[PDB]
Design a protein around this ligand. Structure first.
Ligand SMILES: *[C@@H]1O[C@H](CO)[C@@H](O)[C@H](O)[C@H]1NC(C)=O
Ligand SMILES: *[C@@H]1O[C@H](CO)[C@@H](O)[C@H](O)[C@H]1NC(C)=O
Ligand SMILES: *[C@@H]1O[C@H](CO)[C@@H](O)[C@H](O)[C@H]1NC(C)=O
Lengths: 139, 235, 651, 237, 190
């Protein structure tokens, strides 16, 4: 409360945050929503860090308080999304729905009869109403 | 099925009730295709005449989906010897076509390499059948299922007075009274993987049902996957 | 697999100039001749992980790792864990990374032997420098710890291009495999059970990398140059008196001492007054343990008594060759105000970097009362925390573990602290910053919840520092702080022996003659308690003269180390004592004088010049007696006493 | 729980290492003589309590059940200011018996070096912690050693067996009621180089006797032996 | 694991070919045939050190049947060292074929560190790990004249090393390339 008349009309964006320094309680009075208040705060205090955008390999960038986040899409990883995602049948069956088998030391998948490999090359699409393993839980 | 609980309608579709001359399951059955049923080859020494009442959910009364199927011929392993404890597997070709419906869906073979690398490397396995509800308790009136965990090779060897071959593996509890029992003769024991249950084996023998220090002597399905397929195409 | 728990350990082998034995040479030693032959700061490649897959910022070493010494980043994780340890070699040679007892294949093994396999199964076996080659190994039951044993199972990892040549020069790091539900997912250390990993052997330079032998041929014999004569028979690269080897008394700590092959370098680690505990299916108790090479040993420990005790291998030749430390044991309970409200802390020690005007450290230290009752500046610093720190000198590196904080609201103006950190240093230069428990580089305690509302913060490793700066990270509104610390005196018995709490009974002591009245009743002894109020008959002599005494008959001889005194209620006056004398005995018939060991004349122990200010008085000769006549020698007004002694029991 | 007033005195012995002087008599042996080894004495050091012939250089066996307090009077009859330091007992600094940079007081340092010809009552109250546990044989084995010189004292002697047993099983004499006999075994690589007198003694010593010259041991059949195997030497042996 | 040997001359006869070994078995299903015939029973690892210039048959062996004159040749460039050798179960490390087994197998071992090593040696299996009661070693130290009976969970396909972590040049070339494949024989007739 820089001026005592800040919280008498309502939390005003200008009167509290721009013309004066809105405390986070009065910043709430301006917004009354934690997520948008924090997103405002991220550059209300130390600006933006996503504008640098070192997020290689189309890595989506998220700015915060003095920080950025290179959230890497599949096939990319690392601090700035600089490393290809290692595919191995050891972990999560190579992301294959049913079966995995390294060829050229790389993941290629397969599916049981009554199932077909999806276009992603990992998922299995059941082609039968009563397929393998899948319980016939009609009810 | 020592302890355990009933298979929900459809939860155990490949599971079959091998109805003998008196139409009461002398063995646990396993639906394989539209014409095939799986049982341990020990079931061949216990038969006058027998059929396959697929879809049975209660030995007390018929409660839906019970279709009687007749075994055309049995694919017994030619190396099947009781003393080896091995090849205790009998593929049952059926005269009556299996009608894939509610509580009727088989368990088919995965990749042999993937099966060896994944199936026997799992943590627990699920066994079902109209088995003895306790170590000696009465046979499960309903189709009762149960889950049992894997056992290390050395633990099975010390826990068995006999050989634990390159295939047979223990699965159950050290002292807890829960496992397959009388009623799971060839009773299908499976293992969940992304809701697709995989038959990792079936008990053959053992000292009592889930006794202290004892386990079900299951058969390594991945060991004879090639033989399982070649008997699928046999007879 | 589905187990997840992947930990991006961005490890980086770095050819650093590790200080093997720079420590004990910095304490005393001979003044003539030379020191240890070389500084033992040999440029060697050790494991120091980064926190970036870019590998631009190194993951810093922390307080829990101060006793680890040369030991690299510990790959500590629970059962059924795959860890994405990304290894980017920063050394010169093309190294690798092989661990022991993990789920590693020929594509993830550091040994470049004849595995007879393609280059997918050889890239791991030889990692070029400058190259981020990640490693992923799965924790299994075989690698896991023991349910009746320890909650973590230790292993080791190293570059295996030429392992004998590799671990020498420091290519070795601590590797412990724990079981689930021990480490927090925030930061990987066990909260419940304190563990310690050490390596008490010789470390050969002859096999070291970068041992293109540098300062040699000056050895008189093969047993002359400590590079290849005494190859650092050492605790963690340190031979004698490793710092950071201190722990509370009567508190359980797990052992993870390891030995690594070599040549039968066995060490029966003697503990001066300590008993071990086997952690396993039998749970036996041990005195010492022979450090068997090629074996990893884990135990549990509970310290017996506080003070300094010698860490040593009972093997005399190895002990004189290293593996030595005077490990100090802290007091088990340390929550006691060193001052800042009791007046024990000198006001000179109470200093801040900057001021505001009637906003002073004297006002800050006082926890209650006063209009302007805090230190302040106009606002928090912007470029960093960078607060006008309040330095707390002590003239001694006391043990500090606790702290209590609060603000102050007045004139409808509320101001307090929202977050703060502490800077501590034995000197005023190497201003270390406290850290334990957290991924954050240092600690950032939340301040106090509200102005004029007391909040308490704690320190997990008790830091020791003669000078302690405190620059808060973020304070509510204008800065405003009322504070008081908690802890215990360093390297000595600092426990409340009584006469303020219920430790000392009323019957235990006696005084000459108590004041008594009909309206105000009596003014007895045995109520003289550091904070006694209400009907405060603390101690007031009816005769009111120097010959009055306060004979303290303890239940047994006890080792009293200090004493304070402030006095009772003002009572519309300032009634107290100015100075006193101490006469002690084991039977009371004696009154063996207490003084600075001078003569039969007691040292004039100054009392409490006020009726509310605690006056610290120390005991250079530790008082050992049960019958102790305390004579209030000097008094301005009538005798008053609200005291508290410090020390412990002799046994 | 019993209060053990032990009276031990270090004293140099011209030790022969032979089982007996034999018909040849005299003592013409290795130049390892004047070996200061503490020996148990009668209460108030009336005289040294007799030592077993098998325990030639082996010192006073000190059995102790839990809860005891051992008033170990150590008249340093050896002409050197000495000390005795235990290994696995949570002692007090007043009877610490070990001199180092503990920053302690002289009263807690006098134990660390006791004057020659002077009795010091090395008192330590035993606890249930300092005793055999579950899954632990009825007795435990430890060592009290001369901390005055951990290098030279051993080769000059100053050795004595330390045993801690459970309550009940321990007898008044120290034997186990469940055990017909108890046997203590010791080996050493005694070297006169690191001794009081100086010589190149590569001669090896089982108990107090050299390279396999023990007086023989007779044990009756079906005798429940509670053994006590001790192996100590300067270097790694 | 408990060995046996001769008594007429311990030193020179252990230096000769007088040593043997049996097992003190608590086993139940053995019948003198196999401890529990469900795990591989390959057992012996004996890195014993034999000096033929210390053997009982030093005379005839060294003198009559070598490429040197009939001198004992204790003094030597390296014949005190040539005739001494840390062979593995009567076979030198350099001329021993690599091992090989198929997967799903457990090899029940009964070792014997008997040689005059004068320095404890630490064997190690690459990828594969040991057993020690409940504990799993993966790197086992050895002690002289002692039998060590454990099993190994051989769980990593391909060839792998029976290597030593001490790796001292004295007994350095100790690594056995034991193979691991998924049990090639499909058996079951067809
Ligand atoms: C790798 O980087 C380091 C410094 O980070 C550099 O000193 C080194 O020379 C580089 N490696 C080479 C040239 O092999
Ligand atoms: C410390 O470790 C605990 C253990 O539960 C964890 O919850 C906590 O977040 C860590 N940090 C702090 C500040 O206590
Ligand atoms: C005595 O030997 C028997 C043999 O079974 C054993 O039970 C007991 O533990 C032994 N005593 C000790 C102290 O080891």
């Amino acid at each position: 409360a820089n001026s005592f008349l800040e919280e008498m009309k309502k939390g005003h964006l200008e009167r509290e945050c721009m013309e004066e320094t809105c405390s986070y309680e009065e910043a709430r009075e301006v917004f009354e929503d934690s997520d948008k208040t924090n997103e405002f705060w991220n550059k209300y205090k130390d600006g933006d860090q996503c504008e640098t955008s070192p997020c290689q390999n189309q890595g989506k960038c998220k700015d915060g308080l003095g920080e950025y986040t290179c959230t890497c899409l599949e096939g990319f990883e690392g601090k700035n999304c600089e490393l290809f995602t290692r595919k191995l049948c050891s972990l999560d069956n190579g992301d294959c729905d049913q079966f995995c088998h390294e060829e050229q030391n790389s993941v290629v998948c397969s599916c049981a009869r009554g199932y077909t490999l999806a276009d992603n090359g990992k998922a299995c699409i059941p082609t039968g109403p009563y397929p393998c393993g899948k319980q016939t839980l009609e009810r | 099925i020592v302890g355990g609980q009933e298979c929900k309608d459809g939860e155990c579709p490949w599971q079959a009730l091998l109805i003998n001359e008196e139409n009461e399951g002398f063995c646990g059955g396993t639906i394989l295709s539209e014409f095939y049923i799986l049982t341990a080859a020990h079931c061949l020494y216990q038969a006058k005449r027998f059929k396959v009442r697929v879809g049975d959910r209660n030995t007390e009364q018929e409660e839906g989906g019970e279709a009687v199927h007749e075994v055309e011929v049995v694919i017994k392993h030619n190396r099947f010897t009781k003393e080896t404890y091995d090849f205790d597997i009998a593929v049952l070709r059926l005269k009556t076509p299996i009608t894939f419906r509610m509580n009727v869906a088989p368990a088919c073979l995965p990749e042999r390499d993937w099966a060896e690398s994944t199936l026997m490397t799992q943590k627990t396995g699920i066994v079902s059948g109209f088995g003895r509800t306790h170590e000696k308790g009465r046979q499960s009136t309903r189709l009762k299922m149960l889950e049992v965990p894997y056992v290390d090779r050395n633990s099975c060897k010390l826990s068995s007075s006999f050989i634990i071959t390159q295939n047979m593996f223990c699965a159950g509890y050290d002292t807890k009274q829960e496992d397959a029992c009388q009623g799971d003769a060839g009773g299908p024991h499976v293992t969940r993987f992304k809701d697709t249950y995989f038959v990792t084996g079936i008990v053959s023998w053992g000292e009592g049902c889930a006794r202290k220090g004892k386990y079900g002597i299951y058969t390594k399905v991945t060991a004879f996957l090639k033989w399982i397929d070649r008997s699928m195409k046999t007879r | 697999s589905n187990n997840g728990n992947r930990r991006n350990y961005y490890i980086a082998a770095e050819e650093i100039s590790w200080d093997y034995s720079e420590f004990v040479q910095r304490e005393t030693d001979i003044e003539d001749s030379d020191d240890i032959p070389e500084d033992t700061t040999y440029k060697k490649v050790v494991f120091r992980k980064y926190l970036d897959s870019t590998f631009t910022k190194r993951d810093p070493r922390g307080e829990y790792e101060e006793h680890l010494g040369i030991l690299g980043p510990i790959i500590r994780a629970e059962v059924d864990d795959v860890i994405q340890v990304r290894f980017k070699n920063l050394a010169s040679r093309p190294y690798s990374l092989h661990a022991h007892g993990l789920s590693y294949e020929k594509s993830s093994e550091g040994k470049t032997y004849e595995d007879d396999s393609p280059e997918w199964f050889k890239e791991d076996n030889a990692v070029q420098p400058n190259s981020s080659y990640t490693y992923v190994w799965h924790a299994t039951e075989r690698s896991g710890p023991e349910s009746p044993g320890s909650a973590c199972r230790a292993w080791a990892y190293y570059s295996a291009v030429n392992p004998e040549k590799d671990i020498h020069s420091g290519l070795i790091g601590p590797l412990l495999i724990c079981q689930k539900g021990i480490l927090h997912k925030d930061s990987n250390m066990p909260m419940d059970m304190r563990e310690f990993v050490l390596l008490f052997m010789t470390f050969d330079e002859k096999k070291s990398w970068y041992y293109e032998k540098k300062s040699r041929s000056s050895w008189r014999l093969t047993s002359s140059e400590m590079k290849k004569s005494h190859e650092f028979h050492a605790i963690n690269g340190m031979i004698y008196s490793l710092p950071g080897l201190k722990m509370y008394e009567q508190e359980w700590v797990r052992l993870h001492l390891l030995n690594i092959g070599g040549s039968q370098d066995i060490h029966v680690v003697h503990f001066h007054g300590q008993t071990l505990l086997e952690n396993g299916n039998k749970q036996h108790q041990l005195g010492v343990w022979p450090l068997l090479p090629g074996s990893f040993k884990t135990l549990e420990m509970k310290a017996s008594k506080p003070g300094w005790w010698l860490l040593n291998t009972e093997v005399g030749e190895n002990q004189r060759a290293g593996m030595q430390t005077p490990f100090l044991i802290m007091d088990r309970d340390c929550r006691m105000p060193m001052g800042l409200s009791t007046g024990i802390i000198s006001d000179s020690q109470i200093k801040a970097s900057e001021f505001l005007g009637y906003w002073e450290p004297r006002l800050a230290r006082l926890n209650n009362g006063g209009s302007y009752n805090a230190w302040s500046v106009e606002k928090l610093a912007a470029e960093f925390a960078s607060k006008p720190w309040i330095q707390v000198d002590m003239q001694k590196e006391v043990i500090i573990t606790g702290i209590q904080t609060q603000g102050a609201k007045h004139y409808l103006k509320s101001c307090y602290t929202t977050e703060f950190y502490v800077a501590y240093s034995s000197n005023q230069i190497n201003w270390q910053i406290f850290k334990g428990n957290s991924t954050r580089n240092v600690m950032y305690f939340n301040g106090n919840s509200d102005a004029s509302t007391i909040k308490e913060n704690q320190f997990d490793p008790p830091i020791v520092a003669r000078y302690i700066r405190i620059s808060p990270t973020r304070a509510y509104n204008r800065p405003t702080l009322r504070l008081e610390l908690q802890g215990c005196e360093v390297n000595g018995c600092s426990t409340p022996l009584g006469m303020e709490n219920g430790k000392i009974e009323n019957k235990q002591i006696t005084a000459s003659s108590f004041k008594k009245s009909w309206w105000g009743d009596y003014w007895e002894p045995f109520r003289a308690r550091l904070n006694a109020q209400g009907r405060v008959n603390a101690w007031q002599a009816k005769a009111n003269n120097n010959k009055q005494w306060l004979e303290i008959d303890l239940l047994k001889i006890k080792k009293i180390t200090a004493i304070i005194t402030q006095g009772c209620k003002s009572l519309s006056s300032e009634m107290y004592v100015k100075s006193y004398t101490i006469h002690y005995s084991e039977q009371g018939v004696e009154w063996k004088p207490y003084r600075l060991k001078s003569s039969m004349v007691d040292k004039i122990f100054e009392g409490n010049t006020n009726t509310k200010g605690h006056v610290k008085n120390f005991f250079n000769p530790p008082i050992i007696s049960r019958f102790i006549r305390v004579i209030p020698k000097t008094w301005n007004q009538s005798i008053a006493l609200r005291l508290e002694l410090f020390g412990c029991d002799i046994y | 729980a019993q209060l053990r007033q032990f009276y031990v005195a270090a004293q140099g012995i011209s030790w022969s290492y032979r089982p007996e002087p034999t018909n040849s008599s005299l003592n013409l042996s290795v130049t390892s003589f004047k070996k200061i080894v503490y020996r148990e004495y009668e209460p108030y050091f009336k005289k040294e309590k007799p030592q077993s012939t098998i325990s030639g250089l082996l010192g006073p066996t000190l059995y102790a059940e839990v809860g005891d307090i051992i008033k170990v009077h150590f008249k340093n009859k050896a002409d050197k200011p000495l000390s005795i330091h235990p290994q696995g007992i949570r002692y007090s600094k007043l009877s610490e018996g070990a001199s180092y940079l503990d920053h302690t007081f002289p009263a807690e340092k006098m134990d660390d070096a006791v004057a020659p010809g002077r009795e010091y009552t090395y008192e330590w109250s035993i606890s249930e912690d300092s005793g055999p546990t579950h899954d632990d044989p009825p007795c435990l084995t430890h060592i009290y050693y001369s901390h005055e010189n951990l290098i030279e004292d051993f080769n000059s002697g100053l050795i004595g067996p330390l045993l801690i047993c459970k309550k009940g099983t321990l007898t008044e004499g120290g034997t186990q009621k469940t055990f017909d006999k108890q046997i203590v075994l010791l080996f050493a690589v005694f070297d006169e180089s690191k001794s009081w007198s100086q010589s190149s003694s590569l001669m090896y010593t089982v108990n107090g006797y050299v390279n396999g010259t023990m007086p023989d041991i007779t044990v009756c059949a079906h005798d429940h032996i509670s053994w006590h195997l001790l192996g100590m030497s300067s270097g790694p042996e | 694991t408990r060995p046996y040997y001769s008594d007429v001359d311990i030193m020179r006869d252990i230096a000769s070919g007088l040593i043997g070994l049996l097992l003190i078995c608590k086993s139940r299903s053995l019948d003198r045939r196999g401890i529990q015939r469900a795990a591989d029973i390959e057992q012996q690892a004996v890195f014993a050190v034999f000096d033929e210039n210390k053997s009982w048959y030093l005379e005839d062996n060294i003198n009559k049947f070598c490429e040197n004159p009939d001198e004992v040749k204790r003094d030597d460039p390296k014949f005190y060292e040539s005739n001494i050798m840390s062979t593995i179960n009567g076979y030198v490390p350099e001329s021993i074929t690599t091992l090989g087994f198929c997967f799903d197998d457990t090899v029940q071992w009964h070792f014997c560190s008997v040689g005059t090593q004068n320095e404890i040696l630490t064997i190690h299996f690459t990828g594969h790990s040991f057993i020690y009661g409940k504990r799993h070693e993966d790197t086992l130290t050895l002690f002289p004249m002692r039998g060590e009976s454990v099993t190994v969970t051989m769980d990593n396909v391909g060839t792998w090393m029976l290597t030593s972590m001490n790796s001292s040049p004295r007994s350095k070339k100790l690594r056995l390339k034991f193979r691991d494949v998924k049990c090639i024989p499909d058996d079951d007739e067809d």
